[PDB]
Amino acid sequence: GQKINPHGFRLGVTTDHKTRWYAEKQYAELVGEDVKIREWLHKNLERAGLSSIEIERRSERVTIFLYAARPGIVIGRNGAEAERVRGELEKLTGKQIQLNILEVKSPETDAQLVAQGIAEQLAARVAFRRAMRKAQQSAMNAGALGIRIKCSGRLGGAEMSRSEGYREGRVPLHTLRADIDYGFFEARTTFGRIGVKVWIYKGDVT
Amino acid sequence: PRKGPAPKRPVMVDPVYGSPLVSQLVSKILLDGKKTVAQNIVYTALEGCRAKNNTDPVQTLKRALDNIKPSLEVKSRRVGGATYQVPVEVKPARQTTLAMRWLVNFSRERREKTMAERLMNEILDASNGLGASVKRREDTHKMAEANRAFAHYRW
RNA sequence: GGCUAACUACGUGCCAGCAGCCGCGGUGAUACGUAGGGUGCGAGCGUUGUCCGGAUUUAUUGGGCGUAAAGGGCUCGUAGG
RNA sequence: GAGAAUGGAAUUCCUGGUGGAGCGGUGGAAUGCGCAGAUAUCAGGAGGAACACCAGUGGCGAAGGCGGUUCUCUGGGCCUUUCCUGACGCUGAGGAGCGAAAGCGUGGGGAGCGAACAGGCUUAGAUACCCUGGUAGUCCACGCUGUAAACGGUGGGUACUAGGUGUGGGGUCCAUUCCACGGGUUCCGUGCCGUAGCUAACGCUUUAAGUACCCCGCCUGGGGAGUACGGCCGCAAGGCUAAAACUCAAAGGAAUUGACGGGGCCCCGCACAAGCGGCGGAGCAUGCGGAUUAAUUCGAUGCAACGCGUAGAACCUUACCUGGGUUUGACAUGGAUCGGGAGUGCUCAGAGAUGGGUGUGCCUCUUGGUCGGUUCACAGGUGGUGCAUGGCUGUCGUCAGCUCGUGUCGUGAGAUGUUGGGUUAAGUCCCGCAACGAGCGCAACCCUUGUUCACUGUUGCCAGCACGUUAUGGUGGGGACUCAGUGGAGACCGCCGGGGUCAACUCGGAGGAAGGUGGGGAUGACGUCAAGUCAUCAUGCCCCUUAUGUCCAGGGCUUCACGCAUGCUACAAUGGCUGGUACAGAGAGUGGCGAGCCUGUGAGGGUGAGCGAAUCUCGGAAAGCCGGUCUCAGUUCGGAUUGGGGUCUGCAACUCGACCUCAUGAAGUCGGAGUCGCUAGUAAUCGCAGAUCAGCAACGCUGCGGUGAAUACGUUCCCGGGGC
RNA sequence: AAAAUGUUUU
RNA sequence: GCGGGGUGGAGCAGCCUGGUAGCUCGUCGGGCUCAUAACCCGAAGGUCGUCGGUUCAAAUCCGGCCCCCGCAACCA
Ligand SMILES: CON(C)Cc1ccc(O)c2c1C[C@H]1C[C@H]3[C@H](N(C)C)C(O)=C(C(N)=O)C(=O)[C@@]3(O)C(O)=C1C2=O
Ligand SMILES: [Mg+2]
Ligand SMILES: [Mg+2]
Ligand SMILES: [Mg+2]
Ligand SMILES: [Mg+2]
Ligand SMILES: [Mg+2]
Ligand SMILES: [Mg+2]
Ligand SMILES: [Mg+2]
Ligand SMILES: [Mg+2]
Ligand SMILES: [Mg+2]
Ligand SMILES: [Mg+2]
Ligand SMILES: [Mg+2]
Ligand SMILES: [Mg+2]
Ligand SMILES: [Mg+2]
Ligand SMILES: [Mg+2]
Ligand SMILES: [Mg+2]
Ligand SMILES: [Mg+2]
Ligand SMILES: [Mg+2]
Ligand SMILES: [Mg+2]
Ligand SMILES: [Mg+2]
Ligand SMILES: [Mg+2]
Ligand SMILES: [Mg+2]
Ligand SMILES: [Mg+2]
Ligand SMILES: [Mg+2]
Ligand SMILES: [Mg+2]
Ligand SMILES: [Mg+2]
Ligand SMILES: [Mg+2]
Ligand SMILES: [Mg+2]
Ligand SMILES: [Mg+2]
Ligand SMILES: [Mg+2]
Ligand SMILES: [Mg+2]
Ligand SMILES: [Mg+2]
Ligand SMILES: [Mg+2]
Ligand SMILES: [Mg+2]
Ligand SMILES: [Mg+2]
Ligand SMILES: [Mg+2]
Ligand SMILES: [Mg+2]
Ligand SMILES: [Mg+2]
Ligand SMILES: [Mg+2]
Ligand SMILES: [Mg+2]
Ligand SMILES: [Mg+2]
Secondary structure: OOOOOHHHHOEOOOEOOOEEOOOOOOHHHHHHHHHHHHHHHHHHOOOOOEEEEEEEEOOOEEEEEEEEOOOHHHHOOOOHHHHHHHHHHHHHHOOEEEEEEEOOOOOOOOHHHHHHHHHHHHHOOOOHHHHHHHHHHHHHHHOOOEEEEEEEEOHHHOOOOEEEEEEEEOOOOOOOOEEEEEEEEEEEOOOOEEEEEEEEEEEEOO | OOOOOOOOOOOOOOOOOOOHHHHHHHHHHOHHHOHHHHHHHHHHHHHHHHHHOOOOHHHHHHHHHHHHOOOEEEEEEOOOOOOEEEEEEOOHHHHHHHHHHHHHHHHHHOOOOOHHHHHHHHHHHHHHOOOHHHHHHHHHHHHHHHOHHHHHHOO
């Protein structure tokens, strides 16, 4: 209601932009194609689990880094799915796409995949308290210095909306040098959708 | 304020007449942030003063300020169900400020055409002992004397 | 619905109605109406009436009286204990 | 306790002396009293009532209660070693007596006080509080009444069960006295603390609410109701005894945590105060309510809606209205099926949508890209619900807080930590502490500004050197200065002195560009308001489907008896007009910024370099200074309105654009009650730039620099908040 | 120094 | 029959006599308040029951009428 996005707050200070290109007469159209690419990838690769999509451009050539928990879905069988998604990318944009897919070393520590999993459990109708506790425990088993999860909505299929949250460790949202990874997802249930937000304090950075 | 007495900005001296009084006068005229206009007015008034009398304009301004300086003035007090007018002695800085404010306001209220020698006329009249500024000083002193019975409420 | 063994869908929309108490119905009704499913009983099953129990809620077994209901305004003194 | 006499002060009244204008009373007043001499002051007198000091932390009484002194009469208590009687004790239904004050009866008395009452004030009213008067009553005698929060809300008697410590009464003992000071000890009171124990807790605890025994009174949910009926008592008021119908599902006890308080203590904020400038009046701009309309689309409604979504409504936007079209649809995705063009140029009809012409007409390949229909699936919705939601935001609030783990306390909610003392902008620290710790907030890390160093030197800069058309750092060149932008340094109460038990902090000083957080921004804890948004997006459910979809033209969102709100320009001389002349910053630019020249009164037009920009352009900064002029005039102020002639953008300026020019010259004389902003480069004012944008109703918004104040004693009051 | 009040949502 | 009364929304002044229609409350518009009441600041509001006459001029003077009151309506 009144809290800033941690990633935007720390943008330029500790964290970096997801897109790296320069253009001053096409800026809008490159932004539009980037939006198309990201929407297409998110809409067609939910199963893999997308941590981030990172876009680079050199000269009419686009490079897409896809940070995914399980790139097995993206690569398919012997790269067939990778080739088909690349081909759909040329079909969508019209430019030469070089697509590479990267792992996440600690999916239980990356907040975006944590929100992915919590929302998936909520959609599969798992008790939200149990799901949040499992995610929290897994994060601290991995070794994060602080977890904070908040699920808001018609939790448990109820009528009134709740804002149930869990946290322990330390999550200094106000500290800029604090490396805080923020993830968000929406569990699509038979009763609207639940917003799941996750903050994970990786540690302190210069 | 609650915390304590806020610091006062030091008063500069007038380059021409070498007196902080004239600088305070121009800073009191000082409408709209036009320092140059205000001190053009003030210098014109002081030169008119030295024209109409041989004595020094800074000295005549000083004499006017002493003739307009109030010694005590009454303030509202909320004791009981009725308001009182408690007379309070006035410190030298406060009384110089009051004299300057009254001088400037009544100069602005004078009937003559231009502000410069409206202020000049008011200054000369005050130095002599006449004018609206001196009348207001006498009236405030008179009302303080009338309400002198509440000098024991001072804190 | 809970006490109380056994739950969902459809219809209705503080209406129609339910209820022993708490309460339910105001558009997602496990509480109304129907259906499927279930549970308790079974030539019976429920409801009403009445009595005892739970009620130590008249306490002999087995309670209490400063503030929760409860020490007489105070003493003298008769029967009684 | 009863009776009688009696003492002094004070009030009131009376008489006299003196003296003269008020007195009295309150928050402020008035009623009232007073020159017919009050109030005040002194003397003398009368009368009624209550007894300062002693006097409480105390004494006595069965309770109610009891305070001048003296005498008379009288009740009970306490102690004592001997003495006497020898269980004669305890309690006590019914009964009887006593029983504050108010009240009643007969008579007396009546100073003060004072229900009722009268008047004055306050008030919306004031049958009240407050003020001036004032009768019963208060007093006495004899009766009556018989009730009180008549309470220790605790019946009487008895025995037992740690202490500690005040105090009242009687003995007795001791040392020095041969008093008494003192200590003990014993018996009886009366308080406080406190163990065991008890209690729901609060608390009680040898004066039990503990452990026990004896007797009495009494309770059985809350109301109805201590009411009705009956009876008894009373002169009366009323008292005593004492139900039922009906009705509710609670009523209640103690305590916990919050919130609130016209509760306290301590604090803070432009919250007041001290100041400066406004708003509310006028004209216009803009938003909204209302009204109106075919439509005046929808959302926002105390602060925290109202120059807000709108960072741009002539068409478009557009969601609204009239009317004209369309139906797998304006747009998606997938199967089939007939295909080769799709898609378009020119024309015709039409307000346009659209429809009809005419030209042009796939690339692979024998089975794709692309489209067509017919369907089939399906799409579409700014339609509903922000009280089904996600997301995002306001807000209390930059407020100093909000919690957790473990321990501990309590039956429990819960508490402790987080209270206390000091300090701080701060739950910031310090000291002590049944707490020991941690977390989110505070702070810091980030951006910007203030000083400085190194590095680099163009498109920036020009100190020393060489020319330049006269001229322009224009030129070669230069790392000095400025600046640009990367990386460092710098501030930490770090140093010195005082205060501070110390300790945190605090005061002063030096150094320094900067000193005690240096200025500003970003950052908004747990949560609150079912706060806003289904209309940015997303979405549960519901609703529309030849229409609530969708296309188009025109209209509307711009209405106008009105009301509010935010602004702008003013009301003039610190000003208007006019000529000259200085000094910025931050920004924008290729359908763009446009110089220069020519043309026009001007908006502009015509040509048109340069610049994707530290280069070129926007560009002029304005206020200011200087010269002239106007001379207090509803004006040479003000620039609304209205008439004429235009320019530009755009398919198109009627509704409904900006601008130019000519003429016109409205209200307005500083604005009622009320109200707003601001503590320093701030307020006040002055111009400039950008977003959106063809153009612009922009005076809005977000920034930028120029000029540049007054004041803050202080926390009493108003508003908001913080700790206990 | 006096200074009142706060219907019925679902 | 005698005498009085009829004036904004209400209740009341203006009547010897002609010329200027007032106070209180209420209505309406704005403040104060979270909101209402109260209070604060501004505004509208009756051509005087009706007909006619007097007069330069009528709420005012005179008459008729309508309405509301009061009084009287008596002696056998
Ligand atoms: C009416 O339906 N029933 C009766 C209840 C109701 C039901 C559903 C709703 O969704 C809302 C409401 C009440 C309204 C009241 C609104 C009002 N406001 C519009 C001025 C207001 O007075 C405040 C406020 N000052 O705080 C609010 O709270 C408010 O805005 C709000 O949230 C509301 C709702 O939306
Ligand atoms: Mg069961
Ligand atoms: Mg249903
Ligand atoms: Mg029984
Ligand atoms: Mg029973
Ligand atoms: Mg019991
Ligand atoms: Mg007992
Ligand atoms: Mg009781
Ligand atoms: Mg008793
Ligand atoms: Mg009795
Ligand atoms: Mg006996
Ligand atoms: Mg007697
Ligand atoms: Mg005393
Ligand atoms: Mg005592
Ligand atoms: Mg014997
Ligand atoms: Mg009796
Ligand atoms: Mg009596
Ligand atoms: Mg009597
Ligand atoms: Mg009598
Ligand atoms: Mg009285
Ligand atoms: Mg008593
Ligand atoms: Mg009792
Ligand atoms: Mg007894
Ligand atoms: Mg006993
Ligand atoms: Mg004792
Ligand atoms: Mg007890
Ligand atoms: Mg009775
Ligand atoms: Mg209580
Ligand atoms: Mg002020
Ligand atoms: Mg105005
Ligand atoms: Mg509207
Ligand atoms: Mg809507
Ligand atoms: Mg809401
Ligand atoms: Mg709404
Ligand atoms: Mg901070
Ligand atoms: Mg709401
Ligand atoms: Mg919708
Ligand atoms: Mg509009
Ligand atoms: Mg550019
Ligand atoms: Mg400040
Ligand atoms: Mg007769």
